[PDB]
Design an enzyme around this catalytic site. Structure first.
Site, PDB file in Angstrom:
ATOM      1  N   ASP A   1       0.811  -1.208   0.000  1.00  0.00           N
ATOM      2  CA  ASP A   1       0.000   0.000   0.000  1.00  0.00           C
ATOM      3  C   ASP A   1       0.849   1.264   0.000  1.00  0.00           C
ATOM      4  OD1 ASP A   1       0.992  -0.269   2.559  1.00  0.00           O
ATOM      5  OD2 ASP A   1      -0.955  -0.035   3.573  1.00  0.00           O
TER       6      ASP A   1
ATOM      7  N   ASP B   1       8.018  -4.709  13.789  1.00  0.00           N
ATOM      8  CA  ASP B   1       8.660  -3.405  13.758  1.00  0.00           C
ATOM      9  C   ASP B   1       8.868  -2.759  15.122  1.00  0.00           C
ATOM     10  OD1 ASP B   1       5.826  -3.437  13.194  1.00  0.00           O
ATOM     11  OD2 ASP B   1       5.891  -1.284  12.770  1.00  0.00           O
TER      12      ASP B   1
HETATM   13  O1  LIG Z   1      -2.016 -11.762   6.600  1.00  0.00           O
HETATM   14  C1  LIG Z   1      -1.380 -10.903   6.201  1.00  0.00           C
HETATM   15  C2  LIG Z   1      -1.825  -9.569   6.235  1.00  0.00           C
HETATM   16  C3  LIG Z   1      -1.015  -8.529   5.727  1.00  0.00           C
HETATM   17  N1  LIG Z   1       0.254  -8.830   5.185  1.00  0.00           N
HETATM   18  C4  LIG Z   1       1.136  -7.781   4.638  1.00  0.00           C
HETATM   19  O2  LIG Z   1       1.667  -7.078   5.761  1.00  0.00           O
HETATM   20  C5  LIG Z   1       1.899  -5.710   5.375  1.00  0.00           C
HETATM   21  C6  LIG Z   1       1.209  -4.685   6.325  1.00  0.00           C
HETATM   22  O3  LIG Z   1      -0.173  -4.945   6.159  1.00  0.00           O
HETATM   23  P1  LIG Z   1      -1.196  -3.731   6.286  1.00  0.00           P
HETATM   24  O4  LIG Z   1      -0.742  -2.649   5.476  1.00  0.00           O
HETATM   25  O5  LIG Z   1      -2.622  -4.167   6.077  1.00  0.00           O
HETATM   26  O6  LIG Z   1      -1.166  -3.314   7.789  1.00  0.00           O
HETATM   27  P2  LIG Z   1      -1.023  -1.944   8.540  1.00  0.00           P
HETATM   28  O7  LIG Z   1      -2.403  -1.448   8.874  1.00  0.00           O
HETATM   29  O8  LIG Z   1      -0.334  -0.909   7.731  1.00  0.00           O
HETATM   30  O9  LIG Z   1      -0.231  -1.901   9.814  1.00  0.00           O
HETATM   31  C7  LIG Z   1       0.730  -3.071  10.018  1.00  0.00           C
HETATM   32  O10 LIG Z   1       2.093  -2.663   9.470  1.00  0.00           O
HETATM   33  C8  LIG Z   1       2.709  -1.528  10.122  1.00  0.00           C
HETATM   34  C9  LIG Z   1       4.064  -1.123   9.464  1.00  0.00           C
HETATM   35  O11 LIG Z   1       3.906  -0.645   8.125  1.00  0.00           O
HETATM   36  C10 LIG Z   1       3.021  -2.045  11.692  1.00  0.00           C
HETATM   37  O12 LIG Z   1       3.382  -0.849  12.562  1.00  0.00           O
HETATM   38  C11 LIG Z   1       1.705  -2.673  12.311  1.00  0.00           C
HETATM   39  O13 LIG Z   1       2.000  -3.162  13.750  1.00  0.00           O
HETATM   40  C12 LIG Z   1       1.108  -3.703  11.251  1.00  0.00           C
HETATM   41  F1  LIG Z   1      -0.082  -4.181  11.854  1.00  0.00           F
HETATM   42  C13 LIG Z   1       1.414  -5.595   3.920  1.00  0.00           C
HETATM   43  O14 LIG Z   1       2.513  -5.696   3.020  1.00  0.00           O
HETATM   44  C14 LIG Z   1       0.450  -6.775   3.756  1.00  0.00           C
HETATM   45  O15 LIG Z   1       0.384  -7.276   2.464  1.00  0.00           O
HETATM   46  C15 LIG Z   1       0.710 -10.177   5.153  1.00  0.00           C
HETATM   47  O16 LIG Z   1       1.791 -10.483   4.704  1.00  0.00           O
HETATM   48  N2  LIG Z   1      -0.123 -11.191   5.666  1.00  0.00           N
HETATM   49 MN   LIG Z   2      -0.506  -0.420   5.634  1.00  0.00          MN
END
Ligand SMILES: O=c1ccn([C@@H]2O[C@H](COP(=O)(O)OP(=O)(O)O[C@H]3O[C@H](CO)[C@@H](O)[C@H](O)[C@H]3F)[C@@H](O)[C@H]2O)c(=O)[nH]1
Ligand SMILES: [Mn+2]
Length: 342
Positions: free
Chosen positions: A108, A186
């Site tokens: 994203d 992270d």
């Molecule tokens: O089942 C899954 C669901 C998503 N992913 C991948 O994990 C990545 C982060 O997912 P997503 O953007 O929906 O989560 P996000 O709300 O940004 O926050 C997380 O990512 C943040 C960092 O960018 C971090 O701070 C936070 O604690 C996270 F929750 C993205 O590349 C997805 O395709 C996956 O590999 N398997």
């Molecule tokens: Mn995201």
């Protein structure tokens, strides 16, 4: 050198926007191969990725089972899945493909025109300075009114790992994999046991922007902060610039002298735009309460991870406020972060 871009995907078809920008700006397919690792098995997303053909290499996380979580984490299954995918995908990059480094990009994220140029120019710095452990495209305090549009080339060191488009060496994966966490990867990297006092390079104007309002985490952080981060649109030829100022020896002498040599101004004066003749000032905080209060008064991120403020370096947060350069800093006696500052 060859630096692959590892795109992490799952079930959002909008990975299309991410790939379109990466492919449009890529200066060399040979130097920047794109590897898209997809988790989840979402058919529409898989078809979207496959449609790019040989422009990318599509790999699929093999274990799609549910993960047993600890008692305090029933609501957090998705975070465990993210961590599992990262371990597998980075393992493919560094063990199977055996690349020397990689730039990690979540699905994203939209990249800036000079995203590749930026990493190409900074890779050698990361290679040479063991006090650095990453190069990130993200400025945590990068909202439009808080960055200097006339200095798109300006870079900094930060103790706060930003993620969101970041470069790491195979050497770092060697250190992290044996102890990779079950979840919250992270924030785990932000802990001192992992960071070991190392910094990352980050820009004045971000080279990535997130458009993922809907995702694993609740959208309030996106709605109140992430959506406002400005994407750089002015191409900067970083490979033609002298980036030696980022070396630790030079930075810790010159940047700190700059911060502590600047006149101190009370937070109220900065807020109301008094004493405008002072184009660069220092606002001093002395405790957790004053840091939080002053950060809020000036509109910057006030949360801390393991005692480290967003984009902070030696406790200093640097940004622009109504056209003025401001360094929110601790006393010069600062000697380390305190994880109890929550
Ligand atoms: O089942 C899954 C669901 C998503 N992913 C991948 O994990 C990545 C982060 O997912 P997503 O953007 O929906 O989560 P996000 O709300 O940004 O926050 C997380 O990512 C943040 C960092 O960018 C971090 O701070 C936070 O604690 C996270 F929750 C993205 O590349 C997805 O395709 C996956 O590999 N398997
Ligand atoms: Mn995201």
């Amino acid at each position: 050198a060859v630096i692959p871009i590892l795109v992490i995907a799952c079930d959002r078809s909008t990975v299309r926007r991410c790939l379109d920008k990466l492919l449009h700006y890529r200066p060399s397919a040979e130097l920047f191969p794109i590897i898209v690792s997809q988790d989840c098995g979402h058919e529409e997303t898989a078809q979207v990725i496959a449609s790019y053909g040989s422009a990318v290499t599509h790999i699929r996380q093999p274990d799609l089972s549910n993960i047993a979580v600890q008692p305090d984490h029933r609501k957090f299954q998705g975070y465990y899945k993210i961590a599992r995918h990262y371990r597998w995908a980075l393992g493919q990059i560094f063990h199977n493909f055996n690349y020397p480094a990689a730039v990690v990009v979540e699905d994203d994220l939209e990249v800036a025109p000079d995203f590749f140029e930026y990493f190409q120019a900074t890779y050698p710095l990361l290679k040479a300075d063991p006090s650095l452990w990453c190069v990130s495209a993200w400025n945590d305090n990068g909202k439009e009114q808080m960055v200097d549009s006339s200095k798109p080339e300006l870079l900094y060191r930060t103790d706060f790992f930003p993620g969101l488009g970041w470069l790491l060496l195979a050497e770092l994966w060697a250190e992290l994999e044996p102890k990779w966490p079950k979840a919250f990867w992270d924030d785990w990297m932000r802990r001192p046991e992992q960071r070991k006092g190392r910094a990352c390079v980050r820009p004045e104007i971000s080279r990535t922007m997130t458009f993922g309002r809907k995702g694993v985490s609740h959208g309030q952080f996106f709605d109140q902060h992430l959506k406002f981060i400005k994407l750089n649109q002015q191409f900067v030829p970083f490979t033609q610039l002298d980036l030696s100022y980022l070396q630790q020896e030079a930075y810790d002498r010159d940047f700190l002298a700059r911060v502590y040599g600047a006149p101190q101004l009370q937070v109220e004066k900065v807020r109301t735009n008094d004493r405008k003749e002072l184009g660069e000032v220092r606002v001093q905080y002395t405790g957790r309460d004053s840091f939080k209060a002053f950060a809020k008064a000036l509109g910057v991120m006030d949360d801390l991870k393991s005692g480290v403020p967003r984009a902070g370096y030696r406790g200093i947060v640097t940004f622009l406020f109504r056209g003025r350069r401001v360094h929110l800093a601790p006393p010069q006696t600062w000697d380390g972060y305190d994880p109890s500052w929550t």
